């Protein structure tokens, strides 16, 4: 085995490179991105980037982020979403302007209820138990402009508030967060964003940091 | 002993989680031993007592 010693040398070098790259990747945080069509995920992804699967890389005070845009896949989500089980954040983008819109090529299913149904299917999927959902109620401005005339009762017939913006968006947040059944373990970080220089990158950074610390305190049984 | 039996019977509430559990039990047993040092000192010097 005079030559096979060099083979073992190659194996050890490859193992060393494997371990270094693996620790480098496990250093980084993986964030899913999903939502209805035209949910305004383009504006959100543009804001974080300024600061098949579409992978987008950004940094916010180290803790280098890799973001995975999945909307591109028109296929069976059941056999695909068994991946991404190790993501420490699931950025869900939904546009509040969807409440007024009757259709998305889907038999006059209201786009808001279609988004809630997708949220129900993805949040309570038994693959994702420790992964936390970051909820971007996007286009808060266009919602504020629409709610002034068209009552949310067209979307949520049991709503009895005065259609004032705060009492409407608080209801949408309450409903989306109550749609999460396994609230004992999961956390929903609801935030309101629009097409402007918000803290949405800072808010993602803070929510991801908190989820990381929560995960580590579970690792040692401190939490 | 009271604090020990409080953690032992409340070994699952999030504040005993925050206390780190068994590392805190090690600390509190250390306090117990540091207390028993006093009981050991007042005894007759003898031979074993001075060693302990």
Curated annotation (Swiss-Prot), chain A:
Keywords, ordered alphabetically: ADP-ribosylation, Cell cycle, Cell division, Cell membrane, Cytoplasm, Cytoskeleton, Disease variant, GTP-binding, Lipoprotein, Magnesium, Membrane, Metal-binding, Myristate, Nucleotide-binding, Palmitate, Transducer
GO cellular component terms given for this protein: centriolar satellite; centrosome; ciliary basal body; cytoplasm; cytosol; extracellular exosome; Golgi apparatus; heterotrimeric G-protein complex
Protein modification: (Microbial infection) Deamidated at Gln-73 by Photorhabdus asymbiotica toxin PAU_02230, blocking GTP hydrolysis of heterotrimeric GNAQ or GNA11 and G-alphai (GNAI1, GNAI2 or GNAI3) proteins, thereby activating RhoA.
Region (G4 motif): 134-141
Keyword Signal assigned: no
Domain G-alpha: start-end pairs: 27-223
Membrane-topology descriptor: Lipid-anchor
Record InterPro entries: Gprotein_alpha_I, Gprotein_alpha_su, GproteinA_insert, P-loop_NTPase
Stored Pfam families: G-alpha (PF00503)
GO biological process: adenylate cyclase-inhibiting G protein-coupled receptor signaling pathway; adenylate cyclase-modulating G protein-coupled receptor signaling pathway; cell division; GTP metabolic process; negative regulation of adenylate cyclase activity; positive regulation of macroautophagy
ADP-ribosylcysteine: modified positions: 220
GO molecular function terms attached to this record: G protein-coupled receptor binding; G-protein beta/gamma-subunit complex binding; GDP binding; GTP binding; GTPase activity; metal ion binding
Localization annotation: Cytoplasm; Cell membrane; Cytoplasm, Cytoskeleton, Microtubule organizing center, Centrosome
Region of interest (G1 motif), ranges: 30-43
Result of changing residue 53 to A: No effect on binding to PLCD4
Assembly and oligomerization: Heterotrimeric G proteins are composed of 3 units; alpha, beta and gamma. The alpha subunit contains the guanine nucleotide binding site. GTP binding causes dissociation of the heterotrimer, liberating the individual subunits so that they can interact with downstream effector proteins. Forms a complex with CCDC88A/GIV and EGFR which leads to enhanced EGFR signaling and triggering of cell migration; ligand stimulation is required for recruitment of GNAI3 to the complex. Interacts (inactive GDP-bound form) with CCDC88A/GIV (via GBA motif); the interaction leads to activation of GNAI3.
Protein name: Guanine nucleotide-binding protein G(i) subunit alpha-3
Annotated source species: Homo sapiens
UniProtKB/Swiss-Prot annotation, chain B:
Residue numbers on the Cytoplasmic membrane side: 9-22
Subcellular location: Cell membrane
Superkingdom of this protein's organism: Eukaryota
Residue stretches spanning the membrane: 23-43
Organs and tissues of expression: Strongly expressed in the cerebellum. Expressed at low levels in hippocampus, hypothalamus and thalamus. No expression detected in liver.
Extracellular-side positions: 44-52
Biological role: G-protein coupled receptor for glutamate. Ligand binding causes a conformation change that triggers signaling via guanine nucleotide-binding proteins (G proteins) and modulates the activity of down-stream effectors. Signaling inhibits adenylate cyclase activity.
Subunit (UniProt): Interacts with PICK1.
Family: Belongs to the G-protein coupled receptor 3 family.
Protein name: Metabotropic glutamate receptor 4
Lineage per the UniProt record: Eukaryota, Metazoa, Chordata, Craniata, Vertebrata
